[PDB]
C-alpha cells in the first residue's frame, strides 16, 4: 500500500504530500498537530454523522408509508401536517431572533449584486471568475444577443460599425437610466472634466453636471483631460472610458471606448455539483486550485490587481480587482477514498473538505506574493449545500468549530452559506438559520436541487408534473418568497446575503436582461450567474432595482403558508396525450445522457451542454438529479413503461453522439450500448433512482467514474 498510517486513518500519498509540501508551509500550523487533529476530528464526529443520513432513511421511510396506505388523493393537509409533526420532519419554529455573524466584508454584509459560481478543477475557468470583478459592458453587448443580429447588426469575422453604434446606443441608455444628468442625456455628451470636485459633462449648447453629484467616485487622468471617470449607483460601480484613438473611441460623440461595471462581487469556487472528483487525485486538483487563488499566485493567465482612481477632491484610493471568494464544500452524504480506515472504510467527504479548504483558506487571509487576496476582515466562507433540518446545520457547524480548533483559528472564522435546498430545511427554514445564527453569512435558494428532493420525498404519492412545468408550481414559488421572508425576519438585511439561484441559458442573455430583473425585484441580494458575461449583464439589474429599498418594504411580511409549501407538485387526471409523453420522455433521457457522458468519460461535471431543441444550457449535477428522479416516479406510476425508456435512451445516444461533435476526446455511445459505461451509469440512475437516498446520483455516479478510470488503465 502506498498509503500513510495516522491513527486510524491510511492517507492517500498524493494527499498527504500535498497538504505537507503546499498547504501547510506558511500557516505556521504544526503538521503531526494538523494530521492528528484530522484523525481526532473524523474520529470524533464520523457517527453523528452517520446517525444524521440513517434518520434521512428513517423520515424517507415513513413518509412512503403514509402515501401507500392512503387511497383518497383529494389530500387532506391536516392530516398530513399533522404527520410530518408526529414524526419530527416538521419542527416548533422558534421565536424571533437577530443573526450575530460578524467579521465578514461588504461585499456579503452590504453590495447587492451577481455572484458566479464555477468549478474549482478548471484552473482557467477559476481564474477568470475570480478576474471577473470587473467587466466590459460592450463586450457583454456586443458579443450576445442582448443587441439583436437583425439585418445589418450581425457579428461577422470583424467588427460590424452599425452593431457597435447599437452597443453604443444601449450603453448611453444605460447610463442616463442610473446617474442621470441634471439636465440632457449622455447620449449627447461631448466631454467629461472635473472642476472643483465634480463631473463637468458637455453637452452641445452647455455643459451639466450629475442630477446627484455624490454619484461621482473618482476618475483617472488630468481632470482637465481624464482618461476614464468613476460613477458609483446602488453601492456599484460604473467606470467610462475614454480614448478617441481607439476603434470605438474615434467614432464616438466623447471619445468613449468602454463602459465597465462592476460585475462578480462575489465568487463561488465549486468542489461539489459543478466538478467530477471521485478519488484522491481529483480532490488534490482541486484543492491545488483553491490553494493557488488564496495564495494569488495561480497561473493557467494571472490573476489581476487592485485597480488605482483619484478621488473627486484629488486624492488618491483604490477598489479590489478581483471578486471576494466563497468555497462550496461537499455535503454530508459522500465519503472518499481519499483516506480509509483501517478496515478499509471510506472517510467521510464533507468532513475532509471542512479540514483541507479551512486550512488553506488560511492562504488568502495573508498577503499574497502584494495584499492579501481574500477577506480583510478576517473570515472564511463556505458554502454547505444538501442540508436537511436544523440538526444537520447545528453538526455543520460543530464540525467548523472542531476545524477552527484544529487550525488554530478563533471561533466563528468559518462562516456558512446555507443552501436552501432540501424540503426539511424549506419547512423549517428559521430553526436552521438559527442553529447557524453566529456563523451564517447567506442563504440561497437552489432550486434544482430543491425540484430534486421534491420529486423523491413525494414519489409514492402519485405521478409529478413535467420538469418544465415544476419552476412554475406553487409549492416553488412559496419556497422562493418564504426564503426571502425568512432571511429578512433573522435581519439579514445589511448582515447577510439573501440569494437566488443560476440562470442555465449561457447564449439566451437577452431573455436573461428581460426576466432575471425578477430576482432582485424580489427582494434578492445576489444571485447565481454562469459566466463573467452573465455577471456583467446581471450587473445591469442591480442599477435598475434598489435591493436595500426592496428589503426595507418587504419587511415583517409572511407571503408563503406552510400548507403552500407543503404542495405537492402531482399531475392533474389525464394531463398529458401519448405525444406529449414521449416528448418529455426524450426530453430527460437526452438531458441525462448529455451531462452523464461528459461526466463518465471526461470528469467533467460542468459545461454548455445542448438540450434536446439545441438550446446550450450551463447546469450542475442537480439537473440529473431532477431528471432521473422524474422519470423513476413517472415508472414508479405507470406513466411509461421500461421499454419506453429503453427506446428513448437509443434515440436519444446518436443525437447526443451527434451533439458532441465538439471532439477529440469524445467516444460515441451508440451503437454499442451496453460497452458504454456512460451509457449504462444513464439508465441505471433511472432505474435505480427510486432507491437511491434522497434521489441522490452521486452514490452511481462515482461508481461509474471509477469504473470509467480503472479501465482507461488497463
Ligand atoms: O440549483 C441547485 O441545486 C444548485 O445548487 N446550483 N445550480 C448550479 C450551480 C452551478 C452551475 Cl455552473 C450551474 C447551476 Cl444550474
Ligand atoms: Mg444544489
Ligand atoms: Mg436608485
Same mark, same amino acid.
Given at each position: ?417 446555507? +443552501? ?43 405521478? +409529478? ?7 412554475? %408550481? ?89 400548507? %403552500? ?52 444550457? +450551463? ?71 427510486? %432507491? ?23
Amino acid at each position: 500500500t502506498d498509503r500513510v498510517s495516522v491513527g486510524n486513518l491510511r492517507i492517500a500519498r498524493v494527499l498527504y504530500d500535498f497538504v505537507n509540501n503546499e498547504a501547510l508551509p506558511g500557516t505556521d500550523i504544526d503538521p503531526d498537530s494538523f494530521w492528528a487533529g484530522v484523525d481526532k476530528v473524523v474520529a470524533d464526529l464520523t457517527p453523528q454523522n452517520q446517525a444524521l443520513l440513517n434518520a434521512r432513511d428513517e423520515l424517507q421511510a415513513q413518509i412512503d408509508k403514509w402515501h401507500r396506505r392512503r387511497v383518497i388523493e383529494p389530500i387532506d393537509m391536516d392530516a398530513y401536517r399533522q404527520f410530518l409533526t408526529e414524526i419530527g420532519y416538521l419542527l416548533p419554529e422558534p421565536d424571533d431572533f437577530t443573526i450575530t455573524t460578524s467579521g465578514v466584508d461588504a461585499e456579503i454584509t452590504t453590495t447587492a449584486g451577481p455572484q458566479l459560481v464555477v468549478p474549482v478543477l478548471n484552473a482557467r475557468f477559476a481564474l477568470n471568475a475570480a478576474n471577473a470583478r470587473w467587466g466590459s459592458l460592450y463586450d457583454a453587448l456586443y458579443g450576445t444577443d442582448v443587441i439583436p443580429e437583425t439585418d445589418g447588426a450581425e457579428k461577422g469575422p470583424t467588427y460590424n460599425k452599425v452593431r457597435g453604434d447599437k452597443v453604443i446606443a444601449y450603453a448611453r441608455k444605460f447610463l442616463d437610466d442610473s446617474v442621470p444628468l441634471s439636465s440632457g442625456s449622455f447620449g449627447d455628451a461631448t466631454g467629461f472634466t472635473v472642476q472643483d470636485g465634480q463631473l463637468v459633462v458637455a453637452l452641445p449648447d452647455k455643459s451639466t453636471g450629475l442630477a446627484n453629484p455624490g454619484q461621482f467616485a473618482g476618475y483617472t487622468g488630468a481632470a482637465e483631460s481624464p482618461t476614464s471617470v468613476l460613477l458609483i449607483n446602488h453601492g456599484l460601480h460604473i467606470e467610462i472610458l475614454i480614448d478617441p484613438e481607439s476603434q470605438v473611441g474615434t467614432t464616438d460623440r466623447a471619445g468613449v471606448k468602454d463602459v465597465i461595471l462592476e460585475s462578480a462581487i462575489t465568487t463561488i469556487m465549486d468542489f461539489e455539483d459543478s466538478v467530477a472528483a471521485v478519488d484522491a487525485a481529483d480532490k488534490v486538483l482541486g484543492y491545488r486550485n483553491w490553494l493557488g487563488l488564496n495564495k494569488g499566485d495561480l497561473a493557467a493567465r494571472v490573476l489581476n490587481r487592485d485597480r488605482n482612481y483619484t478621488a473627486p477632491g484629488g486624492g488618491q484610493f483604490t477598489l479590489p480587482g478581483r471578486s471576494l471568494m466563497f468555497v462550496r464544500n461537499v455535503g454530508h452524504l459522500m465519503t472518499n477514498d481519499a483516506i480509509v480506515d483501517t478496515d478499509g472504510s471510506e472517510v467521510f467527504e464533507g468532513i475532509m473538505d471542512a479540514l483541507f479548504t479551512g486550512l488553506i483558506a488560511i492562504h488568502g487571509l495573508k498577503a499574497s506574493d502584494g495584499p492579501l487576496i481574500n477577506s480583510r476582515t478576517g473570515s472564511i466562507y463556505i458554502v454547505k449545500p444538501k442540508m436537511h433540518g436544523p440538526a444537520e446545520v447545528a453538526f455543520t457547524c460543530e464540525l467548523f468549530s472542531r476545524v477552527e480548533d484544529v487550525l488554530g483559528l478563533p471561533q466563528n472564522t468559518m462562516k456558512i452559506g446555507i +443552501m436552501d435546498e432540501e424540503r426539511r430545511t424549506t419547512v423549517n427554514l428559521k430553526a436552521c438559520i438559527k442553529a447557524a445564527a453566529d456563523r451564517v453569512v447567506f442563504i440561497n435558494t437552489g432550486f434544482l436541487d430543491r425540484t430534486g428532493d421534491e420529486i423523491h420525498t413525494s414519489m409514492e404519492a402519485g405521478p +409529478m408534473v413535467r420538469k418544465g412545468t415544476m419552476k412554475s %408550481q406553487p409549492w416553488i414559488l412559496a419556497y422562493e418568497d418564504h426564503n426571502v421572508d425568512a432571511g429578512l425576519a433573522a435581519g439579514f438585511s445589511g448582515r447577510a446575503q439573501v440569494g437566488k439561484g443560476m440562470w442555465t441559458m449561457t447564449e439566451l442573455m437577452a431573455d436573461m436582461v428581460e426576466t432575471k430583473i425578477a430576482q432582485p425585484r424580489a427582494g434578492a441580494s445576489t444571485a447565481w450567474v454562469p459566466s463573467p458575461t452573465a455577471a456583467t449583464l446581471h450587473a445591469l439589474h442591480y442599477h435598475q432595482v434598489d435591493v436595500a429599498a426592496v428589503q426595507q418594504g418587504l419587511a415583517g411580511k409572511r407571503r408563503a403558508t406552510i400548507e %403552500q409549501l407543503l404542495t405537492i407538485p402531482l399531475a392533474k387526471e389525464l394531463a398529458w396525450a401519448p405525444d406529449e409523453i414521449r416528448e418529455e420522455v426524450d426530453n430527460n433521457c437526452q438531458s441525462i445522457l448529455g451531462y452523464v457522458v461528459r461526466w463518465v468519460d471526461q470528469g467533467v461535471g460542468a459545461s454548455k451542454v445542448p438540450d434536446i431543441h439545441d438550446v446550450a444550457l +450551463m447546469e450542475d449535477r442537480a439537473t440529473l438529479r431532477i431528471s432521473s428522479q422524474l422519470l423513476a416516479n413517472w415508472l414508479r406510476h405507470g406513466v411509461i413503461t421500461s421499454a419506453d425508456v429503453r427506446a428513448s435512451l437509443e434515440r436519444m445516444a446518436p443525437l447526443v453522439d451527434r451533439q458532441n461533435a465538439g471532439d477529440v476526446a469524445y467516444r460515441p455511445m451508440a451503437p454499442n450500448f451496453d460497452d458504454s459505461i456512460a451509457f449504462l451509469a444513464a439508465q441505471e440512475l433511472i432505474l435505480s433512482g427510486a %432507491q437511491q437516498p434522497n434521489g441522490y446520483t452521486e452514490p452511481i455516479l462515482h461508481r461509474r467514474r471509477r469504473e470509467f478510470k480503472a479501465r482507461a488503465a488497463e
